[PDB]
Curated annotation (Swiss-Prot), chains A, B:
Intrachain S-S bonds: none
Protein name, UniProt field: Bud site selection protein 6
Role of this protein: Not essential for mitotic growth but is necessary for normal morphogenesis. Involved in the organization and/or function of the actin cytoskeleton.
The organism's taxonomic lineage, starting at the top: Eukaryota, Fungi, Dikarya, Ascomycota, Saccharomycotina
Gene: BUD6
Superkingdom: Eukaryota
Coiled coil: 21-76
Anything else known: Present with 2610 molecules/cell in log phase SD medium.
Amino acid sequence: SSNRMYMEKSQTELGDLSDTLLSKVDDLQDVIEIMRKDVAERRSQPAKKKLETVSKDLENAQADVLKLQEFIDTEKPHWKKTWEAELDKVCEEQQFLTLQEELILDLKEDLGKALETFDLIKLCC
Amino acid sequence: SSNRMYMEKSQTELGDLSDTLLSKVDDLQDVIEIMRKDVAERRSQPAKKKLETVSKDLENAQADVLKLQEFIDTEKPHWKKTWEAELDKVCEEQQFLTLQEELILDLKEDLGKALETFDLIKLCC
């Protein structure tokens, strides 16, 4: 597996993990708002079985949150090193082009002066 | 041949071409300065065979200069597109990380409020 392929697969994995958790949190928020609205305005209580399942869904989301943070924490340092490698290489290649462009201008100048000098020499002869 | 490999081989070729020409121009400058010094200070003329060989070395360097410029002109647009592709990709991946880091903060916040609200609900019951 290349550095580039590892980057793209691991970032895709990150996106899938946070996406799955986002949808679980969205679902939890909906269920809990139904509960809050009923208690607040009607003093009507949720079913006991629902309190139980929400309790466990909250516990599961807490666990997933920790795993998501661990994924970011473990992968991030390697991602930065991968980017640094690619960016440093591009920078050096752009600087090379720039240096080569200045060099050819210097060569044309130097060759032009050599020609003129050689022409003077031939005239003198 | 990959984009990256083409970049590295074609830049190496550029460096070899300008290097070869630099050394030819250096040699020409040395030969011509010997001539100039002799004519200027001694009014002593170069050998006819040397005038001939320098004439042709100058013509050859002129031709090489044109070929070097053509190499730069033909390769440069593709090099820039290659760099743009790599830089754009890195930029998007860095932005992705940043967005994912903000997302997990939002998730922790939202999950934390859901927990507190659920605890209020349970208290009410």
